[PDB]
Amino acid sequence: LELRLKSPVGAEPAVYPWPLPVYDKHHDAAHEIIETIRWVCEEIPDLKLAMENYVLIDYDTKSFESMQRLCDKYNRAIDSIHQLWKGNTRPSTGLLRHILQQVYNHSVTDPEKLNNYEPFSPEVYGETSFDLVAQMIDEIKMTDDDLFVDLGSGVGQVVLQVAAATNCKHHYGVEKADIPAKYAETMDREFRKWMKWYGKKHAEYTLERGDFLSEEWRERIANTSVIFVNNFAFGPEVDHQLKERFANMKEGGRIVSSKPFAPLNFRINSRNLSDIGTIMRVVELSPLKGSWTGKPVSYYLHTIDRTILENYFSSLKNP
Ligand SMILES: CNC(=O)c1cc(C(=O)c2c(Cl)cccc2Cl)c[nH]1
Numbered sequence: 001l002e003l004r005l006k007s008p009v010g011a012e013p014a015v016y017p018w019p020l021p022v023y024d025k026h027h028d029a030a031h032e033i034i035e036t037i038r039w040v041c042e043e044i045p046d047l048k049l050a051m052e053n054y055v056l057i058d059y060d061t062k063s064f065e066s067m068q069r070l071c072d073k074y075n076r077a078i079d080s081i082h083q084l085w086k087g088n089t090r091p092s093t094g095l096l097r098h099i100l101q102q103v104y105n106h107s108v109t110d111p112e113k114l115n116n117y118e119p120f121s122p123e124v125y126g127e128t129s130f131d132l133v134a135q136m137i138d139e140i141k142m143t144d145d146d147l148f149v150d151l152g153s154g155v156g157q158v159v160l161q162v163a164a165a166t167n168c169k170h171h172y173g174v175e176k177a178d179i180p181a182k183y184a185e186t187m188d189r190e191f192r193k194w195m196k197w198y199g200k201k202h203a204e205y206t207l208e209r210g211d212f213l214s215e216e217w218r219e220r221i222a223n224t225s226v227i228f229v230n231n232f233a234f235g236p237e238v239d240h241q242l243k244e245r246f247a248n249m250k251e252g253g254r255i256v257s258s259k260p261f262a263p264l265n266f267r268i269n270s271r272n273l274s275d276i277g278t279i280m281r282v283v284e285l286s287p288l289k290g291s292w293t294g295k296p297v298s299y300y301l302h303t304i305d306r307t308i309l310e311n312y313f314s315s316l317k318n319p
Contacts, residue, residue: 001064003033003071006078008040008047009199018064023105030061032102037074039098040198046084050077088201093134096164099194100157101126106194107186108155113179120230120258122155122180128295133161135287136256136299142166142226149174149221151229151242156184156207158228160191163205168226171205174212181209213241222248232258243276246304255302260284262302268312278309 001018014036020029038056041048055073060066091099104125108114111123120129142148146168150158153173163171175181184207195202210217221227227246231239243261246253255261264284266277286298 003067004075005033005036005071006075007197007199008044008078008081009197010082011197011199014197018067020061020067021105027105028061029105030067032105033067033071034059034061035098036102037070039095040074043092043095044081046081047077050080050084052077088199090202091164091195091198091200095198095200096161097126097130099164099191099198099200100130100161103160103187103190103194104155104157106190108183114155114183115179116154118233120232122157122183125157128297129157130161131292131294132287132297132299133158134165135290135292136228136285137162137165139285139290140226140254140256140301142168144169146225147223148172148226148228149224151212151221151227152176152231153184153207154180156187159205159207160187160202162228164195164200164202166203168203171203172220173205173207174210174217175207176209176211178209181207184209213238213245218245218248221245222250224249225253227253227255228257229255230258231261234259246302247276247279249304251304251306253304255280255300257300257302260300260302268308273309273312278312279304279306281305281308 003016003018003020005014007013016029016033022028034056041051052073055070059070104122108122114122116122144167148162148166148168148171150173153159153175156173156175159171159173162168173184175184188207212221222245229242231242239261246255246261260282262275262277262280262282264282266275266282268278272278281303283301284298285301287294288296
């Protein structure tokens, strides 16, 4: 016993076993099936016209016959549309939210294994992070000349969201811990498969297991144009090593973080010449000021700017 959903672009069908998988106490693969059908109908007008929409109103998620009828009605409407078309774009924000959740649900089957009790972690990515990352994407406006890196990428959710939305040359995720890095391999596979099923384009990306403080990563950070780092729980020792890596970045290089690497009110003088604040601008970006009705959250945008240090020396030489 199984349920099948035909791809709107002729990719291999999505195949679900029966009884349907349960994700948590209030979420299961039946709600995922209904929402997938609704998303494909909303974005394919001819499909909405062909589909007998009443089947999406009256259904029983606990009945194999009811769920099979619903899947069959959708599969028949897909077939009618493929017949009509007989005779790749980026996903919308709404579809991407659905895809990322679906990818997670098919990949992270045992979330307890993550041993993650933090507020902005993989298990709660959809609550605020998705919206804040979307706001960040609209704010930094990356181009094909950019290289994006997430330092401590978890199961790779930020990398997948950014790669689906932007045209950076490449997106990298580096994760040290065993369990999220192993789950990132499944997230990668499921993301490519589902994006192909929907017929959606994404930029190139790589999720890798590694230590972002290693020698190999020193040159890699130096060549990165956009660093994303949720450093809130890192503490001052790792934060110190990161500032050393950031100090080799190019002019205009950017760092997006959850805790600033330099004070927001940094004032260069003879006693703090050694501080990272001498070579980077720092601003707090808050969607509540940047409408937003979510949590009162912020991120920090750092921009490599060695003219801060240069102006201090020029002012001493020309008082
Ligand atoms: C206690 N942690 C926080 O307040 C916090 C975590 C984060 C993020 O991980 C993040 C960033 Cl850095 C940039 C854009 C989007 C997101 Cl979700 C932001 N603030």
